[PDB]
Amino acid sequence: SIEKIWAREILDSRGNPTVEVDLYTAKGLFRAAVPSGASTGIYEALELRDGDKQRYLGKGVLKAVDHINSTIAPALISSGLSVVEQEKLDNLMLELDGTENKSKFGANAILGVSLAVCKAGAAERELPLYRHIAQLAGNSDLILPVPAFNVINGGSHAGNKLAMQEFMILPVGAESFRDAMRLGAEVYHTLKGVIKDKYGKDATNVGDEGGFAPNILENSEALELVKEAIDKAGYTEKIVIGMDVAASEFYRDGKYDLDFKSPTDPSRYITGDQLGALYQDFVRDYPVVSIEDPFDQDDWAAWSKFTANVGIQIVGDDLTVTNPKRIERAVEEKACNCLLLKVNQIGSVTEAIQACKLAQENGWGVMVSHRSGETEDTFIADLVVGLCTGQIKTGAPCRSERLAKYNQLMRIEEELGDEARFAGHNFRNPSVL
Amino acid sequence: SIEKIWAREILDSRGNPTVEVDLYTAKGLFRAAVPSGASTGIYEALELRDGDKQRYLGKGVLKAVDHINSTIAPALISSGLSVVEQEKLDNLMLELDGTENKSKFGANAILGVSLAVCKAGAAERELPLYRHIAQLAGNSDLILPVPAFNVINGGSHAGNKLAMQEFMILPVGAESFRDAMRLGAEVYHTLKGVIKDKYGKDATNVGDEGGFAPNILENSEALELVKEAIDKAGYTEKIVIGMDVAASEFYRDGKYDLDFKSPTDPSRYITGDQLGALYQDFVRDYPVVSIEDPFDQDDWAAWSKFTANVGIQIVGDDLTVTNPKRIERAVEEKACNCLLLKVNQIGSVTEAIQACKLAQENGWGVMVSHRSGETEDTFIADLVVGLCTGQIKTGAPCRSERLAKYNQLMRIEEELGDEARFAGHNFRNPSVL
Ligand SMILES: C[C@]1(P(=O)(O)O)C[C@H](O)N(O)C1=O
Ligand SMILES: C[C@]1(P(=O)(O)O)C[C@H](O)N(O)C1=O
Ligand SMILES: [Mg+2]
Ligand SMILES: [Mg+2]
C-alpha cells in the first residue's frame, strides 16, 4: 500500500527545525508536521534533537529524519498493511523503537510518520480526516469545539513579571464555530486597543502564540484586562475565561513563587493552600471556568485538594502529559477533571486516541492542544472534531500557525452542515447534545 | 472543465477576514487564499471590504465572497474553458468586472479565483505549480531565490519611534536555499539575544512579519543591530542588508518626517535631497545592497535623481504597485530598477506575470513579495521560482504564514534536486546563471 515514505526538515513557527513527513500511496501524497513545546514536562516522550551546536544551535532534527527514511519507512512499506490499519502500523513502530519514552527513534519521527499514515488512511476509506478519526475512536456524533484563545501572556517565555502563563477567552455563548471565531477576534482586537491605551504603543507585539504580554505583575490585573475587553466588545455573558497557570515553572522548594522572574527572594513564596485560595478568589471575582496546571506536576495532594473544593474545570497538562499511565493515577486520585491532549507528548495517533478514550471513560473533559512551536499542519483541527472533545486551544486569532487550525475547523463546520453541533456551554460534556 | 467554484471567509495572519477559494476539477480540490497589505499604496487594486461594523469591525469579505459564488463561479463554469486557459479565464473575469481598479467585484475576489485556476491548471498539465507558472511565463531555467528576512521593524504599524519600516537580511553567500534558511534563522535567533541584552526581556516579541520592533529612533541604529547580529553569528561574509523604507508613510508637505510617530513638527522635516544624502551614508557604512520605496509614491523627481546616482538595487513598491502602466512610467523616468511583485496589488495571475516580464524585459530585477496580512497559502513560493526572479521577501523566519513560503521553497529545491540552482550573489539578475 505505502509506495514511499519520505521525511525532511522544516522550520516551525519559532524558526526551529521540525520533522515533516511525506507519505505516498496510490491515491496521492500526504504531508504532516510535528509541533514542539517550549516549557515541557519531564515525563513526555523524547523529542529527538541533534545537539549540533553549530547547526541551528543544536536544534536540528536530521537524526530523527534519518530514522524515518532509513529504518521506519522501509519497515512499514514491507509490512503489507494498509494505511487504514492505524493501530497495527503504530504498534509496529512502537515495536521497532522498543524504548518506553520513544528514545531510540524519537517521538517526533514516530509521530510524523503516524500523522501521515492517518491522513493516508482517511483517503483510502474515502473519508475526511475528522470522520476517519471518529471511526478510529468509536464515535459518530461529531461536534465543533469551543476555542480558547491565549490573549494575555506570562510565565517562563514572557518578558514581563506576570507569573501565570496563559489567560484565555472561551466564547461559550457563540452560535456556531464560525461565530466563535468572530467573537474571539473582535475581543482580541478590542484588547489590542485597550493595552495600547494603557501600556503604550510598544506593548502590542505578540508572543509565540499570538497574544500580548504587557508588563504587569498581579495576575488579577490580567483577568481584569481580559474582562475589560470582553465587556467593551459587548460579549459580557457570551465569553468566559480559561487559564493555563503552568505552576510547575515556579515550583521552588515545595512552594510557589508568583514572582519567579524577579531576583530570587524566598520570602514571597506561598503555599499550595494559599495558591488555591487565590484561585478561589479568581473564580468568585472573575468568570474563570477552567484552570490548567494549577499546581506542580508532582504535587498531587494540592491537585486533589483543589479539585474536590471547586466546581470549575481542572485541566492536567504537565501533570498527565497525554500519558495513559499518569492519567490513570490522576483518575484514581481525582487530581483533575480534564485532560489536555498533545499528540507529540505521547508520540503517536493511536496512543493519543487511547489517552482520550481513557479520560472520557471516567467522565473527564478533553481539550486538544497546540505546542508553542507549531507548523502549517492542521491535524489537531480534525482530531478535536473526530474525538468529540468539545474544546481546543491552539493560539490566539493571530499568526497563521494558529489560524490554519481555526480556518480548517471552519471548513469542517461548513462541510458538516445540518449535522454540525457546537458545544457552546457544554464544552466539558459535549455528549449531552 | 471547472466543476464547482466555492468561496468562504477565513482569517488571515492578523485576525482579519480574507477570501479563500475552492476550485473543483476532475483531478481534485484546489485551494488558495488572498493576502492583505498594511502600508497599502493608493494605486493598488481595490480590496472590497464589507464595512459592516456589526462583524469584524467592518472588515468582512462577504461581499467579495458573494461575487465569486453568485457571479464569477457560474461564469467560468458555463464558459467551458479549460483550467489551463489562465489568460482566457483571467480576461473573462476582467471584462466581467469591467472596472479599471477592479472595484466592482473587488481584487480579492478575482485573485482568489485566479490563484485557484493556476493551481488547477498545473494539475491538468500534470506539472508542479512552479513548472506551470514557468510555462505561463515562457521560462525554462528555474532559479531558487535569495530570501530577504525582515528582522527589524519600524514604520506606521510599529510601536517604536523608528521611521523606516523594514530592515532585512539576504543570505547571498549561501550554498543553497536550504542553507539560506539556516543562515537567516541563525541570525534571527542571534539578533533576539542581541536585542535582549541592549533593550531588555520585554523587547523580544515579534511584529506582523515575525521581526522585532525594538525601541530605537535612529535608522543607523537599526543597521548597527543587524550588522552586529550578522557578525556575532559568523556570517559577516555571506549576508547583506536590505531595507523597505516605505517613505510614502512619512511624506509630509513634499518633505519627509523621520519621526512621524512623534507629535508632528515641521522643523524635523527634510527634503529628498537630504533623504537621498542619508541613503548614501547607509550604502557606504553598511552592506546595504537594496532599498525599497526610498521616496514617496509620487516624488518621481526624487526617484529618478537618486537611482541615477547609486549602484545598489532600487525597488519600487507603492510607486509601481505591480501595475504595467505605473511600471511603464518608471522605466521611462528611470525611477527604479527593481519591481516588487505583489499579486493582490494588481489582482490577477495573468497581469502579475505581464507586469513581471515588463520589468525583466527592461533590465529590471524582480522581488516577489508578501503582505502584512498573509495566510497559510504558499502560491508565491512557486511563483518566485517559476518566474525565475531570483529574490523573494516574505517575512522573518517566524510565524508560519512566513515559514509556509520558506518551507515550500525548501521542498521545491529538493524536488528539483540535481538541476536546482541558487541565485547566490546574482540575485539582482539571475539570468546569467
Ligand atoms: C507552553 C505550552 P507548551 O509549548 O505545549 O509547553 C503551550 C500550550 O498552550 N501549553 O498548554 C503549554 O504548556
Ligand atoms: C508592510 C508591507 P504591506 O503590508 O504589503 O504594505 C509588507 C511588505 O513587506 N511590504 O513591502 C510592505 O510595504
Ligand atoms: Mg499548558
Ligand atoms: Mg514595502
Side-chain angles (χ1 to χ4, degrees):
Chain A
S1 179
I2 309 178
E3 298 186 8
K4 177 191 304 178
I5 293 176
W6 183 253
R8 73 177 59 85
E9 171 179 276
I10 67 163
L11 299 187
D12 56 15
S13 56
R14 307 242 311 270
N16 299 330
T18 190
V19 177
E20 191 189 60
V21 165
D22 289 16
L23 200 147
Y24 291 87
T25 67
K27 280 197 171 65
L29 167 61
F30 305 91
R31 182 163 298 159
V34 192
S36 177
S39 62
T40 92
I42 77 276
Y43 294 111
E44 55 182 80
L46 177 90
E47 166 186 276
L48 189 43
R49 282 290 146 96
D50 290 342
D52 193 331
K53 294 307 173 186
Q54 292 187 337
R55 217 193 75 89
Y56 283 109
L57 213 59
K59 314 247 288 187
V61 290
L62 291 178
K63 293 171 184 296
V65 165
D66 182 88
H67 286 151
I68 294 174
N69 299 331
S70 296
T71 314
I72 306 179
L76 292 189
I77 293 179
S78 302
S79 310
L81 304 170
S82 177
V83 285
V84 309
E85 296 298 328
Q86 182 68 38
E87 177 123 16
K88 286 182 169 299
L89 285 168
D90 281 337
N91 285 336
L92 178 55
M93 284 194 297
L94 307 191
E95 299 162 16
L96 279 160
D97 167 88
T99 54
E100 167 103 89
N101 52 338
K102 300 171 180 54
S103 59
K104 180 168 296 182
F105 290 153
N108 32 10
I110 300 179
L111 178 68
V113 179
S114 182
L115 287 174
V117 163
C118 194
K119 296 186 177 184
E124 214 57 49
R125 316 212 69 253
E126 297 170 1
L127 297 168
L129 182 56
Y130 58 90
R131 178 66 73 181
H132 175 74
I133 290 177
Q135 298 187 5
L136 285 172
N139 317 330
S140 34
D141 302 312
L142 308 165
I143 49 100
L144 269 296
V146 174
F149 312 98
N150 180 29
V151 299
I152 294 297
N153 301 339
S156 301
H157 303 80
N160 53 22
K161 295 304 193 64
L162 195 66
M164 295 172 182
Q165 206 178 71
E166 305 176 4
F167 291 79
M168 300 169 292
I169 59 180
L170 288 76
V172 295
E175 309 286 316
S176 64
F177 186 91
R178 296 159 303 195
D179 190 80
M181 285 300 107
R182 179 177 49 88
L183 270 57
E186 289 175 358
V187 172
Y188 180 79
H189 288 294
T190 293
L191 183 68
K192 181 180 179 181
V194 171
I195 293 181
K196 187 246 293 185
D197 290 326
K198 304 190 189 309
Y199 295 95
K201 306 175 179 300
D202 63 337
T204 65
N205 277 20
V206 307
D208 293 327
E209 291 125 285
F212 321 107
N215 292 333
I216 78 178
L217 178 50
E218 296 295 332
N219 300 103
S220 58
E221 182 175 341
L223 296 164
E224 188 64 50
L225 259 172
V226 175
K227 170 53 58 186
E228 196 157 345
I230 288 176
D231 305 341
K232 192 176 182 179
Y235 301 112
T236 171
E237 54 186 352
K238 293 198 171 189
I239 299 182
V240 293
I241 299 176
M243 300 177 64
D244 179 18
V245 180
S248 300
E249 299 299 322
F250 47 88
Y251 187 65
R252 307 278 105 98
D253 310 313
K255 299 205 172 192
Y256 297 93
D257 185 9
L258 291 183
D259 195 19
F260 67 102
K261 281 165 294 183
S262 293
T264 51
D265 171 75
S267 175
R268 68 203 174 195
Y269 299 172
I270 69 176
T271 68
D273 295 329
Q274 286 179 302
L275 182 61
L278 180 70
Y279 297 140
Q280 299 268 3
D281 292 332
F282 290 165
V283 175
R284 300 158 188 169
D285 291 276
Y286 305 91
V288 177
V289 310
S290 187
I291 290 185
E292 172 188 327
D293 275 345
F295 304 101
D296 183 72
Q297 55 201 341
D298 290 319
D299 195 12
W300 297 84
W303 282 77
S304 301
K305 201 179 196 301
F306 184 73
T307 295
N309 289 320
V310 298
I312 66 169
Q313 180 176 243
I314 310 304
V315 186
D317 185 14
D318 293 315
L319 175 78
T320 52
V321 296
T322 326
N323 196 284
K325 289 292 159 294
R326 287 195 126 252
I327 289 171
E328 284 279 15
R329 178 178 179 178
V331 168
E332 181 173 326
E333 281 188 81
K334 275 167 273 296
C336 59
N337 53 32
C338 188
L339 163 69
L340 201 66
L341 201 81
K342 294 165 172 178
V343 292
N344 64 314
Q345 280 180 331
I346 193 59
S348 68
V349 176
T350 294
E351 275 181 291
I353 298 179
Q354 290 173 358
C356 178
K357 285 182 298 178
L358 175 59
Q360 292 178 335
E361 285 163 359
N362 298 272
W364 279 22
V366 179
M367 186 187 301
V368 173
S369 183
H370 62 162
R371 304 313 299 262
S372 299
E374 270 290 341
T375 70
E376 50 273 34
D377 167 83
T378 67
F379 182 91
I380 61 176
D382 297 78
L383 182 68
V384 65
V385 177
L387 299 184
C388 306
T389 76
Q391 38 189 340
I392 181 178
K393 62 162 193 175
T394 173
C398 187
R399 305 171 68 114
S400 289
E401 70 270 13
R402 318 301 170 185
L403 292 141
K405 288 80 158 175
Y406 289 135
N407 295 341
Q408 176 64 18
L409 287 161
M410 292 196 297
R411 312 185 191 104
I412 292 171
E413 172 173 50
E414 139 196 345
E415 196 183 70
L416 291 174
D418 296 82
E419 175 181 339
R421 253 219 158 271
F422 182 54
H425 298 273
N426 281 117
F427 64 101
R428 302 185 60 179
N429 54 336
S431 56
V432 302
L433 290 169
Chain B
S1 182
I2 297 185
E3 296 172 353
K4 183 186 179 183
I5 292 177
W6 176 259
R8 72 182 65 91
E9 171 180 294
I10 72 172
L11 298 188
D12 70 341
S13 62
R14 316 201 307 186
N16 301 318
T18 187
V19 175
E20 189 182 56
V21 172
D22 294 352
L23 197 147
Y24 293 89
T25 61
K27 308 200 175 188
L29 162 66
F30 299 88
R31 179 127 62 205
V34 186
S36 174
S39 65
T40 52
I42 282 80
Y43 303 91
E44 293 192 10
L46 186 115
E47 162 170 284
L48 180 59
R49 296 288 180 174
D50 297 345
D52 173 31
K53 289 223 148 46
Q54 302 289 294
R55 0 177 301 103
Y56 292 109
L57 293 155
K59 296 181 70 72
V61 291
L62 291 178
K63 299 180 185 297
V65 167
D66 177 42
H67 287 299
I68 295 178
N69 298 325
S70 302
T71 309
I72 300 172
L76 303 190
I77 292 181
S78 62
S79 72
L81 289 168
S82 180
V83 282
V84 308
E85 314 292 340
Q86 184 69 31
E87 189 166 354
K88 296 196 185 69
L89 288 174
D90 281 324
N91 281 9
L92 209 78
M93 289 184 281
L94 301 193
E95 201 220 30
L96 218 71
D97 178 271
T99 316
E100 178 62 34
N101 268 22
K102 303 182 183 62
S103 60
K104 177 167 165 184
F105 296 152
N108 36 329
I110 300 178
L111 185 65
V113 188
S114 184
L115 296 174
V117 164
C118 189
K119 293 187 178 183
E124 237 77 6
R125 298 273 176 81
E126 294 234 335
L127 306 171
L129 177 56
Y130 57 87
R131 255 288 136 184
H132 184 57
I133 302 177
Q135 295 184 356
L136 289 174
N139 299 325
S140 58
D141 304 322
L142 303 170
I143 283 291
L144 280 123
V146 162
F149 308 98
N150 179 26
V151 291
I152 298 301
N153 278 325
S156 38
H157 289 72
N160 50 28
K161 285 302 181 64
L162 189 59
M164 298 168 183
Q165 195 170 246
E166 302 172 24
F167 296 86
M168 300 176 298
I169 49 178
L170 288 82
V172 296
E175 298 295 317
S176 61
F177 181 86
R178 253 89 58 82
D179 189 80
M181 290 308 307
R182 185 181 64 90
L183 268 53
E186 282 183 32
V187 172
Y188 178 81
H189 295 7
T190 291
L191 174 71
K192 186 180 177 182
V194 171
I195 294 181
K196 191 183 187 303
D197 311 335
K198 195 181 178 182
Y199 306 100
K201 305 166 51 192
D202 51 320
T204 50
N205 275 9
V206 310
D208 282 338
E209 301 169 27
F212 312 105
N215 290 346
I216 59 183
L217 175 70
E218 317 299 330
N219 297 284
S220 61
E221 185 178 358
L223 298 168
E224 272 298 307
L225 297 178
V226 179
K227 199 165 71 69
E228 179 181 1
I230 284 177
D231 293 28
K232 216 214 74 184
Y235 296 109
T236 315
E237 328 166 71
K238 302 189 166 194
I239 302 183
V240 290
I241 297 181
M243 298 172 58
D244 178 17
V245 172
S248 304
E249 295 292 319
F250 52 89
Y251 186 63
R252 311 288 181 258
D253 291 273
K255 281 195 166 193
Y256 295 90
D257 180 19
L258 289 184
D259 205 346
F260 69 102
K261 281 171 288 189
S262 299
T264 68
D265 188 42
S267 69
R268 289 284 176 266
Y269 293 179
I270 62 178
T271 68
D273 309 324
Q274 305 176 255
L275 190 54
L278 179 59
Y279 297 142
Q280 310 287 356
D281 307 333
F282 293 163
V283 171
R284 161 244 304 172
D285 294 272
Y286 301 94
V288 183
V289 302
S290 184
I291 289 189
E292 170 189 329
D293 283 347
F295 307 93
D296 181 83
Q297 59 202 309
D298 288 318
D299 199 350
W300 294 84
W303 282 76
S304 295
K305 189 171 85 70
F306 180 77
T307 288
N309 293 142
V310 297
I312 62 167
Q313 186 186 261
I314 306 303
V315 181
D317 179 17
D318 290 334
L319 173 92
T320 52
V321 292
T322 327
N323 208 325
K325 57 203 182 198
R326 275 222 123 193
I327 303 165
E328 230 139 7
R329 180 181 177 181
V331 308
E332 321 294 350
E333 227 111 328
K334 301 194 178 185
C336 56
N337 52 37
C338 188
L339 170 63
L340 195 64
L341 203 83
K342 293 175 176 178
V343 293
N344 87 289
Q345 280 181 326
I346 190 59
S348 47
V349 175
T350 301
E351 278 173 325
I353 294 183
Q354 300 168 2
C356 179
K357 299 207 83 68
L358 189 93
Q360 287 167 324
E361 274 132 31
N362 278 267
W364 285 17
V366 180
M367 172 165 55
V368 177
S369 181
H370 65 154
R371 314 309 305 266
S372 290
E374 275 284 339
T375 65
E376 51 273 30
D377 179 72
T378 77
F379 179 89
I380 64 176
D382 302 44
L383 183 68
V384 63
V385 168
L387 293 170
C388 308
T389 65
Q391 46 182 328
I392 186 183
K393 65 159 200 172
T394 167
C398 183
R399 303 164 61 106
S400 287
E401 72 266 10
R402 322 300 175 188
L403 281 320
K405 284 79 174 174
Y406 293 121
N407 289 330
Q408 173 69 6
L409 286 171
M410 285 193 304
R411 307 187 201 99
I412 294 176
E413 181 176 64
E414 172 215 276
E415 207 189 46
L416 293 169
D418 175 38
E419 59 139 294
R421 301 264 201 84
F422 183 61
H425 304 273
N426 289 278
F427 70 98
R428 290 181 60 174
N429 60 328
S431 193
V432 190
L433 313 177

